[model samples]
Target chain A: MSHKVTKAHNGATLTVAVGELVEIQLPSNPTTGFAWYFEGGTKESPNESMFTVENKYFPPDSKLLGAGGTEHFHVTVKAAGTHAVNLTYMRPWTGPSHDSERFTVYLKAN
Target chain B: LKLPASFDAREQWPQCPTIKEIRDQGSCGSAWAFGAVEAISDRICIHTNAHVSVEVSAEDLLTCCGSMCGDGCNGGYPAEAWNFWTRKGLVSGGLYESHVGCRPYSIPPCEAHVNGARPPCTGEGDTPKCSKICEPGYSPTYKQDKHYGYNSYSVSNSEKDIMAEIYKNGPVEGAFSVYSDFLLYKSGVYQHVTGEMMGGHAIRILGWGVENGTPYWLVANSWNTDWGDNGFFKILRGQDHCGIESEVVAGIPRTDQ
Candidate 1:
């Protein structure tokens, strides 16, 4: 059965529909003052998927972050049911590539 | 023939290429392929006196080049791979077509691609970043995104300066590390391997010298080589033990600038 968990706020919702790609984008850092990209991450379950806004694809390492930084991304919902799509980013303290913030996108499939 | 005394001259070596490691290890050895090819592209810039970032065919190098790929994808070297590039000039950039028919080889006429990188979506294989989910017709080029991130972390500081020169100048000699079973390094020098064991993920360094009298370079390995030693390595200086000196590496940065 397909199901999903929506985000804390109604913004940046991840939709898990079979055969469809879930698109999500993290708001640019208001603190650092720029849009950041994910340094890496993994899928919690075989069905739960995550993709970066930049469009780079990654498989689940389950224990590590995947690398790809773009302004946007599309996640292909693999199963016929609901899935949870979580996206995480590391905010670096210095330079253009660094940050440590975990952003999650929850959605429900129809 | 007697060796020329000039062989020992300090002016002999070329600059190195920028290096970085795959963001995540313990994941995919395809990093081996991606790192190698990325260095190859930069090295091509070194050799040709041109700074072209067009993606060299990773599938061509990976599948076609038997010298690479060890048991369990352990590790490999750039030397042997460099040998392959010297022998077979790679195919032009595109969605990497493995074992596909060879297309016309391209040497840039001193201009950058539209994206300021190599041809897009030209690489293939399943790794942490690049999955085998070929949803064709989505992106026109194979290397678009792949080539995009290749430089996302950006080159090292010294590397950038040299690359600026190489871009304005030409190819520079580069080097990086190869973490594997060090004992298997049959010779104090490397000639060629008889078994499967990949080492030395490729990277480019713009400069080399002795750190307090130890030989090293400002090199770039794909594994964030830019982090340690500023993404550089200190070779045994005066010794090119593994044919590192003989244009064995395609990453000879330009000396003009």
Candidate 2:
């Protein structure tokens, strides 16, 4: 399950085929005002060679109300090139909890 | 029908080409009808061992299915759609403009799906009327070409049974609560991230697998190929995030009639 795009590989340098995808799932507490946001990538149109498709917070268990959950980030690789995936976990609108912990995965696309 | 940790209906039944295609409900909420009909159509081709591949008309079901199935375009019940299938038969149909079947989807889609093939989607429109007829050039009368599902029932909400059912059968119509962020889904195994609970949406759960140790259900959506992973998505499996595993409905297509 080459989930090569997980928190465990946060700073790990990996090589993804020319048009393969890289998925990142991180532990987050959006209920506590912390959410994961894409720092760089296509913003306007989801149609791009290497662009991010926004994902959301999924609780570890739907029954566990306030418990932390997983933040999903999926990047579709359309061309061959190196790309840096940056994700910041923080509450939007307030700069207080900014970049709680930035998760960056360097993808070397052949 | 061997149930592996990862099984895809499309892969199992390659002869059934429709299993790999995705259709758009456009601006309508008839996802209820779309998902159910797609599953039925696939089963029809599969049960025949690829002998026949027909598009179970979504327009026919969405428009003609009565009060029991709920209002058209607004939102409809899952079980009722299947019941409607077993009761009133459906006709063969195709995507918009394909005109290959009796009744093609009336709605148009967006450009290249933003990530796929097919015409781009337009804005929301009104619900289509129940036209009890077939396309101009298509052969056979509407009633004569109609297909039926004989036994419609809900799959037990347990994990093992659901997996087994999909493996042995085909696909099932699944209803799940959608969060706002689902609109941002590009790829990968998905679970709720963060966003407002939009509303209940329906999809076809065709298979299951584990990505990054996360068990997920391989699903097809009516949103078109540009939406998730080419009009399909993978949601949390065992735990049933957003009640995805709760209300699964399916049935066998009647081969004789």
RMSD of each: 16.1, 14.6
Model 1 earns a TM-score of 0.33
Model 2 earns a TM-score of 0.67
Residue range A1-110, candidate 2, lDDT tens digits: 23447766778877777545556777654333235665432222234556545564565433222234566666665566766766665433322122145677776766
What DockQ would candidate 2 receive versus the native complex? Answer: 0.02
> In order, how many clashes per candidate?
67, 13
TM-scores for all candidates: the values are: 0.33, 0.67
After superposition, candidate 1 runs with Cα above 4 Å error: A1-110, B1-36, B46-52, B57-60, B63-72, B77-80, B86-205, B213-215, B233-236, B239-248, B251-257
Candidate 1 TM-score on chain B = 0.40
For candidate 2, the share of real interface contacts preserved is 0.00
